[PDB]
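Same chain as my last thread, 929 residues:
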Amino acid sequence: FSKIVVGNETHKSARNVLEGFAKDIKGKASIDAEKHAYSHPCARSMNKNLFNLEGAVCTNSKIKGNEEKINGAGACAPYRRRHICDLNLEHIDVHNVQNIHDLLGNVLVTAKYEGESIVEKHPNRGSSEVCTALARSFADIGDIIRGKDLYKLEARLKTIFQNIKNKNKSPLDKLSLEQVREYWWALNREDVWKALTCFADGSEEYFIQSSDKEHSFSSEYCGHEQGNVPTNLDYVPQFLRWFDEWADDFCRIKKIKLENVKNACRDEKKRKYCSLNGFDCTQTINECTGCLVKCNPYEIWLGNQREAFRKQKEKYENEIKTYVHDTGISNSNINNEYYILKNNNYETANEFIKLLNEGRYCNKDIDFTNTNEKGTFYRSDYCQVCPDCGVDYEPPGDAKNTEINVINSGDKEGYIFEKLSEFCTNENNENGKNYEQWKCYYDNKKNNNKCKMEINIANSKLKNKITSFDEFFDFWVRKLLIDTIKWETELTYCINNTDVTDCNKCNKNCVCFDKWVKQKEDEWTNIMKLFTNKHDIPKKYYLNINDLFDSFFFQVIYKFNEGEAKWNELKENLKKQIASSKANNGTKDSEAAIKVLFNHIKEIATICKDNNTNEGCDPDKVISVKQIAQYYKRIAHKQLNERGSRSALKGDASKGVFLPPRRQHMCTSNLEHLAIHSLLGDVLLAAKEQANFIKNKYKRQKASNGFKDKGTICRAIRYSYADLGDIIKGTDLWEANPGEKNTQRRLKTVFGIIKKNMPGIKDNQKYKDDEKNNPPYKLLREDWWEANRDQVWQAMKCAMKNGITCGSSDHTPLDDYIPQKLRWLTEWAEWYCKAQSKEYEKLKEKCEKCKAACKKYGKNIKTWEDQWKVISSKYKELYKQAEIYAGNGGPGYDKPVVDFLYNLYLQNGGKKGPTPSTVYSTPEGYIHQ
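reply #2:
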């Protein structure tokens, strides 16, 4: 080795300035810590190298210190952080670690293995890059140890340090726990460093760019044999270091991906001049698919990095306010060992970014302050549509001459929602910029098939466009595949449990998506109207293009390994159908592949909307019971994706305590009237019948004279739906009833049958608890419901479509997630209010005779109030149980009710304790909003 590589021609060198500034705090830390001088892991990433071309992780569930707020507080973790050989740290027990040397044993061992992993995986040497990575790792090791790591072990480590602190009070009795941890680290930095650098070439030296003229180098093997740690990064706040490491990954990856794109799109040799969408421009009038295959994930990757960058930039400013202005409390329960850089004028994110720009890999066409058009974020000049030049029709009589409505998403930038705009905003702008109206003169006897634009709303500056129908079709399909990926990819954020606060942005995005899906289904139908007269599409317009769909999209499925198993299921379903075509050139294969793609995208739109309902959006402040229900639903969704498969459990019916008065009249006779399919059939039947029963109960009470309150009927339908789901799940309150018992008897019978007969679930260890569940088959039934609950709701609203509508025209109520005891308390309170109102008016309508009526009134009201007192008492006890668990961190730190109330409590002001009374601390908590 002993070579000179990895560029780095210029200075500024943010790593080195931050590494240097830290020397003064290091010196301080060294002295005060001395005052107290007295006192396989890689298996998880064994096959992962450090330089894989992946973006940063901006996930709130993994990274601490990212406010659930919209558009800010980012601290996106680097690839390396995610792959640290820390399984041996996870296995640290409080019981086992007693001594300061026990901590060192575990840390030093981890450092030796981490060291080997980092150096062995690097195709480098001849540069400081390998030891730079070790220094970055060293600092994260210290952050983990010290409890300052943004990325249950932390609690164990704190417990261990508390035990050390408590066992050896002197001299540590003068210290906070944080000081004890910091000093332990400071005292042993050298041993940890030496362990980390054990695996190194002699030619490797840790290097600091103190200035463009002053160059400081460590001893042979990056200081392994040196009397000091050559690096001060551990002191550098993790947020700052992550921002710097992030820039190196961005710099490096962008350059690699960009070179791959350039080869894919343009080459003077052989006159290759490809467009963004996979077309050969200025060609003679196949190969350019490769341009599309690489531009698509490239643009997406840059968009994700753009967001990561911007969110971190905002966090920088927030950190500055916290420690630079330092007003009032200013988040005092933290130890950053002083911002310091305030006096080096790094109060402005832009000053910091200029410093950061000269990282290892951007140090030479990247400018991180260039937020203008065509900045580092903008996609290659090559990833654009060629404007009809590189280096311009007549109806066959009455032969299927039809005009199709076309929504053209266009090509501009990422963020499909904003791109669509108008379309997403409303139906009023369907005749807007993205609307195209095409008249396709398509014959099945002649090949003189052309499509013309009737109107241009985005093409108004262009000559009227006329194109061949087969190309038209190709374009339409090509865009559907591209748009599919972009919608699905961008909405991945919304699908995967977006905490509890970002409702308005996803609600708007999910609704646009579904409108878009319906629009595409209609476009598909309108295209098929030209061919369904025969159901034999001439080969020119049949497959040939849809066939080549696997030329792209499939070639990107493995790249976008974000959907994991779900994308594997899609690929398999489409693969089977396309394989049919490959084996047989013609056979209704095209239509089938498109139907598969639509069923997939429709399912996502349903899932998206259902996890972002209108009732879950915001109207200490009061948080609605519906917002917590949305939370539990998001959990159920995630659990199903991990446990089983929606495709495995979703059926198709075309193929197969004081009890509320509504429940007292619920139908269990649907059973008296593809095991999952047979079950779905029986359920949908019950759903429609009960909805019809309720309508009739209140049809007789629809005289529009004191009967104008639509809420009675809406609520009855929603409560019935929720109770039905609980029956299906098999988790209810109503026992000792033959109707209910027979229902549960058959329900446990069918699910056992489902487990044994149906595929996939036939043999999953995940589900091999049903025979020992309480109730039996609880797990499978809950997942079945999660998979089939929308179909059930749809049946009920269909039954009621010609009656009084119930809230929103779309989405499904979250009421099946709200625990039944809480649903019944709410219902009874409303029932009592109505019952009491009726007695009141009779009394007022009714001198001695009114006094007698008053006594009768009081008896009826009292009866209802006493029943209420009993249930409200139970509420209070379950609420207190939630406080009891919360005071110890929560459950494991009516129980589902308790679990529900626990999360509601915390959202409304309670705190996860190792008297914050709020709105839901009382049974009356639903009254004053």
